Write a protein that binds this ligand. Structure first.
Ligand SMILES: CC(=O)O[C@H]1[C@H](C)[C@H](O)[C@H](C)[C@@H](O)[C@@H]([C@H](C)OC(=O)C(C)(C)CC(=O)O)CC/C=C(/C)C(=O)Nc2cc(O)c3c4c(c(C)c(O)c3c2O)O[C@](C)(O/C=C/[C@H](O[C@H]2C[C@@H]3OCO[C@@H]3[C@@H](C)O2)[C@H]1C)C4=O
Lengths: 73, 302, 73, 116, 132, 36, 73, 53
DNA sequence: GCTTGACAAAAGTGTTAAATTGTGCTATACTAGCACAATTTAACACTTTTGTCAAGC
C-alpha cells in the first residue's frame, strides 16, 4: 500500500545512540464522516480519519510502549 | 560567498573554554566591574585613594572587559547551536542568532561562578528566552504583545492535545472549558491569531491582488455635484426666512463656519436668552417643514 | 455627518441611522429568478469561521434563449 | 459554447478606482473599465490625436480632480476642463525618491515646483 | 570618499590614457567617465553612502483589510520592518558595548536589509515570505 | 533608571564579598610588579 | 518519461509531512525526560495534515473541476 | 497644478535631501495596533508624521 | 417678543479600580510560564453645561 510504503521508510525512527527506537505500522481508516452531497452542502472536505499503530522501545530499560495515533482526516 | 557562512567562519576562530577558564574570566569580569563602581563612588564622597593603588585599580576596570568579550566570543557557537532549532517560524536565521547573542550577553552579565555550575547550563536559559521573546516581539507584521502571544500558543497546545483525545477538531465551547475561559474569549483569540497576506502577491496569471482594492473615500462625482446643487437649493430657502431666522439656522448647524453652535453661544451674538433662541429655532423649523418650503428637498433625500 | 445633511434630517424627521448599508445586490446585467436559499446562523449551532455569525447563499438561475453574438460550433 | 454575449458585454461611465493607483479597476467584478495599453497609445500617437490621447490618460483614469470636474461639466453642459497631472506620474516621482533619487520638476526659471 | 581629491584623481587619470595605450587604457578610459561625471556636476559623491533612508508614503504601501476581516499589505512594510529592526538592535548593541564580531555582524545584516529593500535578489539570496 | 551590570552584580554579592575579591585581584597585580 | 499519478502525488506530499515530523520527533526526544515520553509525546501532526491540506488547497496539480458539460469533466 | 513646466532633473539624494523631505523619523517596526487596528505611533503608519487617516 | 427658574439629559472632570502591556527570569549539561512594574483603559462619583418645559413679563 502506498501509505504502507511511506511508513516502511520512516520505521523505525532510531536515536543517534539508538537507545530509543519508534516504529510505525498498520494504517487504519475509519468510515467517512459525511456524504459527498453533505460535504458540498456544508463547505467541508470529504475525508476519513486515519489512525496508526506506532510503538516506542527503550533499549536501556527494554520497556515497550504501544499506543494509537490519530494522523488526521 | 554567503552571509551566514561568513559568520560561522569567525565564531569558530575562538577555542571553547573549560570550567576553570570560565571561573577565572568570571572573576576578572567581576573585579573590574566593582573596581569601576568603587572609583565612581569615591568622587562623590571624596575618599581619594593612593595614587598607585588607583592606577592598578583602573587597569582592573580595563582588564575586566577583555574577560567579558573573551567569554562572549567563546560561547558564540552555543547561540548558533540553539538558534538552528527555530528557523522557519517567521524569522531569519541571522536575526535569531543576534537576539540569541543578546541573551548570551546577559547570561555573562548574570553568571555566578561560586555556584560551580558549567556556563552552558545557565546561559542556555537566557539564549532560549531571548530568541523566543524576540519572535513574539517581531515575527508578526502586526505585533501581538507577549502575553497575548502566550495565550495563543497555549490555546493551540490545548487544541492539539484534545484533538488526539477526541479524534476530531474541538468546538469553541470545549476549548473554552479546557482553558478555563469564555467561549467568546477563545473565538476572539482566534481572530487575533489571523496573520496577514501580501497585496503584491499575484492571482489567474499576471494579476497582482493589489489592483482590486477600492478607494472608499474617493470622491464619487455623481454625489459631490448633487451636494453642491443641494447646498444651492438650501441657500434659496434662507432668503425666504427672516434675516434673524436664517442666521440662527446656520449657526445652530454651522453651515458657513462648518461647526455647530450651542444655544447659549448663539445667545451672545444675538444678545437674547438661550431659550428664545430655542423658541426661534422651533418656529423656524416648523415653517421649514411647511409644504411650500420643503417640497424640493424631498427628492434630494437620497 | 455633513452640516448640509444634518439639517435635512431635522426637517423631514428621518433620524440619521447609526449604521451603514452593506447589502448583497445583484450584479450589473445579471437577471433571473431565485431558485433556493441556504442559511447558516450563529444562533443555531451552525459551524462558522471565527467572527462569522450568519451565512446566506442565494442561487439565481435564468433561461438563456440563443441570442445574437453567442458562440456556436 | 460557454462564451455568451450576456457575460461578455461590458460598459462603464464611472465607477470604483484602485486604492494605490487611481485608475479604474478592471474586470466585471468591479464594473471596471477597458484598458488602453501600450500598443493602443502607439496608434493614437500615429494618428497625431494629442488631445484624445491626453484625455484617455489624464481625466478618464488618473486625474483625481480632473475626472470629477469633467463629470460636473457634462452634467452642467459646460465645456470639458483642461486636464491635470496624472496621479500615476506623481506616484512615479515618489517611487524614485524612495530609491534615494532626487528628481525635481523644473520650470524655465529653474525653480523647484511643489507637486501637491 | 571624504579623503578624495576629485580633481587630481581625475587629472592623473586624465593623462594616463594617452601615454599607456593598450589594455590598461580601456580600464582608465571607462573609469574616467564616472570620475569626470562627478567633476562637472556640483553634486557630492557622498550620496552613494546613506546615513538615512527615505520611507515611501503609506498610501503607496497600503495595509487594508479586504472584506472578510482579513488583512493584506505590501511587502515593502516587511522590508522596512527588517531594516528598522536591525537598525534599532544595532543601536542597542552599541550602547551596551559589544564585541566587534557581534556589532560587525549586525552592520552587515543592516546593509543587506537596505539592499533587499531597494533591489531584492540583486545581491544573492532574495528575501522571501510565506510560500517562498 | 535602567537595570545595569552593576545592579545585577550587587544583587548576588555583598560589598564585603566584592571587596575581598578586589583584594585578591589587587594582590595579583601587586605580586607581578613587586615580585620578579 | 513517466507520469506521477494521483496516488503517488499524494504519496509524495505524505512523505514530506512525515519527514518534518521526523525532525520534531528527534528534537522532542532530547529535551524530553527519559521514561516521560510516549508515542503521543514525540508526535505533533501539524506538518502532516498541513502537507495534505496545502497540496489539495494550493498545489497546481489539484484543480477546480470544470463541470460545464460531463464531457469536460 | 501648473501642467506646463520645462525641465525634469534627477540626481543623487544626499542624506540632507532625504533628511529634509521626511516629515518625521519612523522609529518602530509597528504597523497598526492589533485590537484597535489604528496606526501605532512612531511606527510605519504613524499619523503624527505621514498624515491623518 | 422675550425672560426666568426648575429640571433633566448630556458632556466633562478628577479620582480609582481594573485590564493591558512590557520586562525580567528560569543554575545537570548542552558550543512556556509566571511575577512584577509600568502603562493604559474602564469605571464612577461628581460637577458643569446644555436642551427643555411651564409659566409669566
Ligand atoms: C484554481 C484552478 O483550479 O485553476 C486551474 C484551472 C484554471 C482550472 O482547473 C480550470 C477549470 C481548467 O482545468 C479548465 C478550464 C476550462 O480552463 C481554464 O480555466 C482556462 C481559462 C485557464 C483555459 C481555458 O478555459 O481555455 C479546463 C482546461 C482544459 C485544458 C486542456 C487546459 O488547458 N488545462 C490546464 C490549464 C492550465 O492553465 C494549467 C496551468 C498549470 C498546470 C500545472 C496545469 O496542469 C494546467 C492545465 O492542466 O500551471 C499554471 C501556470 O497555473 C495553474 C493554474 C490553475 O491551477 C491552480 C491549482 C491550485 O488550485 C487552487 O490554488 C491553486 C491555483 C492558484 O492554481 C489551473 C490548473 C497553469 O496556467
Amino acid at each position: 500500500g502506498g501509505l504502507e510504503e511511506v511508513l516502511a521508510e520512516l520505521s523505525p525512527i532510531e536515536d543517534f545512540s539508538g537507545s530509543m527506537s519508534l516504529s510505525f505500522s498498520d494504517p487504519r481508516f475509519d468510515e467517512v464522516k459525511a456524504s459527498v452531497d453533505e460535504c458540498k452542502d456544508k463547505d467541508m472536505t470529504y475525508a476519513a480519519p486515519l489512525f496508526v499503530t506506532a510503538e516506542f522501545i527503550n533499549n536501556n530499560t527494554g520497556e515497550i510502549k504501544s499506543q494509537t495515533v490519530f494522523m488526521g482526516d | 560567498a554567503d552571509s551566514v557562512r561568513a559568520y560561522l567562519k569567525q565564531i569558530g576562530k575562538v577555542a571553547l573554554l573549560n570550567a576553570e577558564e570560565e571561573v577565572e574570566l568570571a572573576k576578572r569580569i567581576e573585579a573590574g566591574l566593582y573596581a569601576t563602581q568603587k572609583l565612581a563612588e569615591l568622587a562623590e564622597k571624596g575618599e581619594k585613594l593612593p595614587v598607585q593603588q588607583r592606577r592598578d585599580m583602573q587597569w582592573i576596570c580595563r582588564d575586566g572587559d577583555r574577560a567579558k568579550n573573551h567569554l562572549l566570543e567563546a560561547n558564540l557557537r552555543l547561540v548558533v547551536s540553539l538558534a538552528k532549532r527555530y528557523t522557519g517560524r517567521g524569522m531569519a536565521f541571522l536575526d535569531l542568532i543576534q537576539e540569541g547573542n543578546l541573551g548570551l550577553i546577559r547570561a555573562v552579565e548574570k553568571f555566578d561562578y561560586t555556584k560551580g555550575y558549567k556556563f552552558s547550563t545557565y546561559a542556555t536559559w537566557w539564549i532560549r528566552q531571548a530568541i523566543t521573546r524576540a519572535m513574539a516581539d517581531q515575527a508578526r507584521t502586526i505585533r501581538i504583545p507577549v502575553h497575548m502571544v502566550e495565550v495563543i500558543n497555549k490555546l493551540g497546545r490545548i487544541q492539539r492535545e484534545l484533538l488526539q483525545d477526541l479524534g476530531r477538531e474541538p468546538t469553541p465551547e470545549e476549548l473554552a472549558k479546557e482553558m478555563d475561559i469564555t467561549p467568546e474569549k477563545v473565538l476572539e483569540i482566534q481572530q487575533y491569531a489571523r496573520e496577514p497576506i501580501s497585496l503584491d502577491q499575484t492571482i489567474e496569471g499576471d494579476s497582482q491582488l493589489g489592483d482590486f482594492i477600492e478607494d472608499s473615500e474617493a470622491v464619487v462625482a455623481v454625489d459631490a455635484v448633487s451636494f453642491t446643487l443641494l447646498q444651492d437649493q438650501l441657500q434659496s430657502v434662507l432668503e425666504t426666512l427672516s434675516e434673524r431666522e436664517a442666521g440662527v439656522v446656520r449657526l445652530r448647524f454651522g453651515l458657513t463656519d462648518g461647526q455647530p453652535r450651542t444655544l447659549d453661544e448663539i445667545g451672545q451674538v444675538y444678545g437674547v436668552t438661550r431659550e428664545r433662541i430655542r423658541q426661534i429655532e422651533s418656529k423656524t423649523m416648523s415653517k421649514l417643514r411647511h409644504p411650500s418650503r420643503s417640497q424640493v428637498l424631498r427628492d434630494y433625500l437620497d | 455627518l455633513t452640516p448640509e445633511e444634518r439639517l435635512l434630517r431635522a426637517i423631514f424627521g428621518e433620524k440619521a441611522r447609526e449604521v451603514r448599508d452593506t447589502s448583497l445586490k445583484v450584479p450589473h446585467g445579471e437577471s433571473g429568478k431565485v431558485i433556493g436559499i441556504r442559511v447558516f446562523s450563529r444562533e443555531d449551532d451552525d459551524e462558522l469561521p471565527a467572527g462569522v455569525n450568519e451565512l446566506v447563499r442565494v442561487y439565481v438561475a435564468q433561461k438563456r434563449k440563443i441570442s445574437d453574438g453567442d458562440k456556436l460550433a | 459554447l460557454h462564451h455568451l454575449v450576456d457575460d461578455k458585454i461590458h460598459a462603464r461611465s464611472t465607477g470604483p478606482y484602485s486604492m494605490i493607483t487611481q485608475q479604474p479597476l478592471g474586470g466585471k467584478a468591479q464594473f471596471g473599465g477597458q484598458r488602453f495599453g501600450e500598443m493602443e497609445c502607439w496608434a493614437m500617437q500615429a494618428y497625431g490625436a494629442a488631445y484624445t490621447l491626453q484625455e484617455l490618460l489624464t481625466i478618464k483614469s488618473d486625474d483625481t480632480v480632473g475626472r470629477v470636474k469633467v463629470y460636473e461639466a457634462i452634467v452642467k453642459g459646460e465645456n470639458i476642463p483642461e486636464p491635470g497631472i496624472p496621479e500615476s506620474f506623481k506616484v512615479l516621482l515618489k517611487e524614485l525618491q524612495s530609491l534615494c533619487l532626487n528628481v525635481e520638476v523644473l520650470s524655465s526659471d529653474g525653480a523647484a515646483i511643489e507637486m501637491r | 570618499i571624504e579623503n578624495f581629491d576629485i580633481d587630481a584623481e581625475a587629472e592623473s587619470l586624465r593623462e594616463v590614457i594617452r601615454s599607456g595605450k593598450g589594455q590598461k587604457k580601456l580600464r582608465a578610459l571607462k573609469r574616467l567617465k564616472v570620475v569626470a561625471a562627478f567633476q562637472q556636476s556640483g553634486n557630492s559623491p557622498m550620496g552613494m553612502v546613506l546615513d538615512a533612508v527615505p520611507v515611501i508614503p503609506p498610501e503607496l504601501r497600503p495595509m487594508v483589510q479586504l472584506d472578510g476581516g482579513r488583512f493584506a499589505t505590501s511587502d515593502l512594510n516587511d522590508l522596512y520592518r527588517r531594516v528598522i529592526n536591525r537598525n534599532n538592535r544595532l543601536k542597542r548593541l552599541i550602547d551596551l558595548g559589544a564585541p566587534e564580531i557581534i556589532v560587525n555582524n549586525e552592520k552587515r545584516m543592516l546593509q543587506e536589509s537596505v539592499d533587499a529593500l531597494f533591489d531584492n535578489g540583486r545581491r544573492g539570496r532574495p528575501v522571501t515570505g510565506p510560500g517562498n | 533608571p535602567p537595570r545595569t551590570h552593576w545592579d545585577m552584580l550587587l544583587e548576588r554579592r555583598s560589598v564585603e564579598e566584592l571587596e575581598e575579591l578586589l583584594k585578591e585581584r589587587l594582590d595579583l597585580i601587586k605580586a607581578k610588579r613587586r615580585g620578579t | 518519461r513517466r507520469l506521477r499519478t494521483v496516488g503517488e502525488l499524494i504519496q509524495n506530499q505524505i512523505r514530506v509531512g512525515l519527514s518534518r515530523m521526523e525532525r520534531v520527533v528527534r528534537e522532542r526526544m532530547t529535551t524530553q525526560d527519559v521514561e516521560a515520553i510516549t508515542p503521543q509525546t514525540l508526535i505533533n501532526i501539524r506538518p502532516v495534515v498541513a502537507a495534505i491540506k496545502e497540496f489539495f488547497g494550493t498545489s497546481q496539480l489539484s484543480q477546480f473541476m470544470d463541470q460545464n458539460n460531463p464531457l469536460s469533466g | 497644478d501648473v501642467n506646463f513646466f520645462d525641465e525634469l532633473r534627477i540626481g543623487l539624494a544626499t542624506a540632507d535631501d532625504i533628511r529634509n523631505w521626511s516629515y518625521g523619523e519612523v522609529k518602530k517596526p509597528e504597523t497598526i495596533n492589533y485590537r484597535t487596528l489604528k496606526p501605532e505611533k512612531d511606527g510605519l503608519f504613524c499619523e503624527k508624521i505621514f498624515g491623518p487617516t
